[PDB]
Structure formats: C-alpha cells, structure tokens
Design a protein around this nucleic acid. Sequence first.
DNA 1: TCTCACACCTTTGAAGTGG
DNA 2: CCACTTCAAAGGTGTGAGA
Lengths: 53, 176
Amino acid sequence: RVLFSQAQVYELERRFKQQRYLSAPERDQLASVLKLTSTQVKIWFQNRRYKSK
Amino acid sequence: GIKVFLHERELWLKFHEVGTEMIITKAGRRMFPSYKVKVTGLNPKTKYILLMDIVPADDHRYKFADNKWSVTGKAEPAMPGRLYVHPDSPATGAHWMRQLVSFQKLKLTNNHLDPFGHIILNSMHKYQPRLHIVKATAFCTHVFPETAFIAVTSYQNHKITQLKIENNPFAKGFRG
DNA sequence: TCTCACACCTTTGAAGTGG
DNA sequence: CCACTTCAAAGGTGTGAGA
C-alpha cells in the first residue's frame, strides 16, 4: 500500500469538515490540487463518510 | 445546563483503587485508560473548542517503597504549562454531543523541551485531568476525581502493571 | 531512576466486492 | 450512494538490559 502524504490527508480532512459530499467536478478540482486520481478522492470521501459512524 | 459523563467509569475505578500510574516517556506515551466522555447541554448551533488540561493533584513528591506510596518532599517546580486541543475543534455542539468525545490521541511526555505539543509531566507527582469546553468569561471545566493519577517512568506497583495488561488491547502479548 | 531495542499485539485505511 | 471486507503498514504495549 501507498499511503497519502501528510499534505494530502490534511487537505482532504479540512474539506470534509466542510462538505461531507462532493459533486462530480468538485472531486476533480480537489483531485488535481492534491495530485491524486479523482477516483481516490471519491473513495476517500466514501471511506471517511463510513468510518465516521 | 451542560454536563459531562465519564465513559467507562467502572474501568477507571478499578484503577483509582490501586493508585493509577501513567507511564511518561520522551516520545510521549498514551494514557491508559483512554479519557473519553459524553457531553450534553451544548447549544447545537454554537461552535466550541474542547481542550484537555492536566493539573497538580497536590504539592508533594512521592516514592514507592515497601509496597506503599509515601510523601517524601514538596512537589518540585513543575512544568511548562500545556494544553491538548481536541483535534475535532472547533465544532458545533451537535458534532460534540453526537457520540463520545475521545481524548485517546493525547500523549504524555517527561521531556521539558518537547517539540510535539504533547503534555509535559514530572515523574512521581500526582496529576488531575480537566476538560474545558470553550466557545469559539465563560468556559466551564469538569473534573472526575477518579481520573487522577501518578506520573511514572516505569510501573512501580506491580498490581497496576497486571491491571494494564489484562485491559489494554495493545498489551495483549503479555496476558495468559 | 531513566532509555531503548526487541517481540508481539492492535488499529488504520486505501482498495475490493457486492447491493 | 451504502454495506461490509481485505490484509500489510503503521504504530502502541510491557520487557529487561544497561545507563
């Protein structure tokens, strides 16, 4: 497994504190910024949404 | 008004009746048990910060000899004040009450020049954890007597060691 | 008293599979 | 979207030596 960088996780976490659901292009703007496939961001939110319960 | 309930109080009490020791190290060491609480009373649309704070239980040094604690001086000039801002802060009261606030990632250090913002303690003094709920004049503080402990560099009372080993999942390679 | 490397465990968490 | 699983890496235990 390759884990996400210190940078990335923090930036994903901050966004989740705000919107806990993202739109189709919202996932892309965020993907590029952190330099991850927009898949990985979708899945992160899905996994974070789950685990927070 | 606002009120707080210590989660897993019963487990804490099994510790409070032997003389709770907590290990401190230079890297920082967790507390066992974990400090978790349920909160109720917060205005759900208000944003709050939840800090943890550790403060002197008395002003004495101690020693463990002959299977007993005993005062052996005045508590030395401890220690660079430090707080633990709960990582979910700041957050709507709703978020805080939703389910247990855990203070499990809090770490205790003996290092007085620590670069991690961990809470600094002095070996062989008694301490008392406090939770503060602060708005983001008014911030209230709750103390649970049974959470008081003695900071140590290694376990003294071997009863405690075994109490940690039976109940702390990370220590399971030491059980029966 | 304090520190550190082990052995031995758990939790973590991105990715997997199905609904 | 959710429900759960998969299974190494990350990392928390007390030990016991050696200061």
